[PDB]
């Protein structure tokens, strides 16, 4: 099933790492929202105007 076996020592490392990473990214997001970003829709305004496709429309 899915063609890969992680091993006995592998799964516990992955558990530890993912668990630890989730909360870190979360606290970063909240601290940032409070201090530097007023709304999140304006943040993505830059993507449309990427030179590669800014005039093809």
């Amino acid at each position: 099933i899915l063609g890969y076996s992680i091993g006995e020592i592998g799964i516990h490392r992955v558990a530890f790492w993912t668990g630890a990473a989730s909360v870190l990214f979360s606290n970063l997001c909240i601290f940032l929202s409070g201090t530097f970003v007023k709304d999140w829709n304006a943040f993505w305004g830059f993507w449309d105007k990427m030179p590669i496709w800014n005039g093809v429309g």
Binding site: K38, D39, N41, A42, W44, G45, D48
Partner: protein, 291 residues
């Protein structure tokens, strides 16, 4: 210590090089918009104006603006009429006998201007007098809706509506005492909710503040913030503008404004209490809410 020292050096650099923070524009009349360079108003026209003020005491044949003297009228015109549109002084006036239109003194503009004056007075009297205390006495004038531009203004620019679809417009064909409500209705699906959220984000971008400006996001149907009542009045006002002046029985027939819906952004322009809005006491009596 290397890190904190580097951060200090960087901040000293920034403070030194950075150009100083800006003081807000202070103008005796408008809240945040000024007409200061009057080079756009030609100078030979300004000379001829002095003569008309000094020569006659009262203005011959004024249909509206009934309680004013030629000097007051001239000053008001140069301050707000030419100032709102940034037009030539002769843009809809002749050198003499400018009470009527003869010899195409840029005809078919003076009458549209007069109708704009009437419409502004009517809006001011019917809708901008609601919960006046604690909101201020600011009043709509030429600078509002025109922002220094004579014609060709756009009520929906491209910069706003980044997330919205470009075909979308504010839906003004609804009763709006509560017609947009969606919570718990059980006869509306996710499509109606999507239209609602489009309109709400538009109101969000128009107003400078965020989404908790008027909603108390724990319960959306609640009216505790009291900044919604103001929005109900403004919504009825925008619907009235569109229905009465933009398209009275079709844009072609008896329409002014060239079929441009008000859109809630051309007025406020990114802030509550829009900058073009005149401070209380700086608008003619006829044009103001209490005449």
């Amino acid at each position: 210590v290397m890190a904190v020292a580097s951060i200090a050096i960087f901040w000293w650099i920034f403070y030194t090089i950075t150009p100083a923070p800006a003081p807000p524009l202070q103008n005796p009349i408008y809240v945040n918009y000024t007409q200061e360079p009057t080079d756009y108003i030609s100078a030979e026209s300004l000379a001829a104006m002095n003569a008309y003020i000094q020569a006659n005491p009262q203005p011959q044949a004024v249909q509206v603006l009934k309680g004013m003297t030629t000097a007051q009228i001239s000053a008001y015109m140069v301050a707000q009429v030419s100032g709102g549109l940034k037009v030539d002084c002769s843009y809809c006036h002749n050198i003499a006998n400018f009470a009527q239109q003869d010899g195409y003194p840029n005809a078919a503009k003076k009458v549209t201007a007069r109708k704009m004056m009437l419409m502004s007075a009517d809006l001011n009297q019917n809708y901008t007098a609601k919960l006046p205390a604690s909101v201020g006495g600011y009043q709509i004038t030429c600078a509002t809706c025109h922002n220094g531009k004579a014609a060709g203004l756009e009520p929906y620019p491209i910069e706003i509506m980044n997330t919205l679809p470009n075909d979308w417009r504010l839906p003004l064909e609804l009763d709006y005492p509560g017609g947009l409500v969606v919570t718990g209705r059980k006869d509306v699906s996710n499509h109606e909710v999507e239209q609602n959220q489009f309109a709400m984000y538009h109101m969000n971008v128009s107003m400078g503040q965020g989404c908790t400006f008027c909603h108390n996001a724990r319960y959306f149907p609640s009216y505790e913030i009291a900044q919604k009542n103001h929005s109900i009045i403004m919504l009825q006002m925008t619907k009235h503008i569109q229905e009465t002046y933009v398209a009275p029985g079709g844009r072609i027939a008896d329409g002014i404004m060239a079929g441009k819906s008000p859109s809630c952004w051309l007025c406020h322009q990114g802030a509550n209490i829009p900058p073009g809005a005149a401070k209380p006491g700086q608008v003619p009596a006829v044009l103001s809410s209490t005449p």
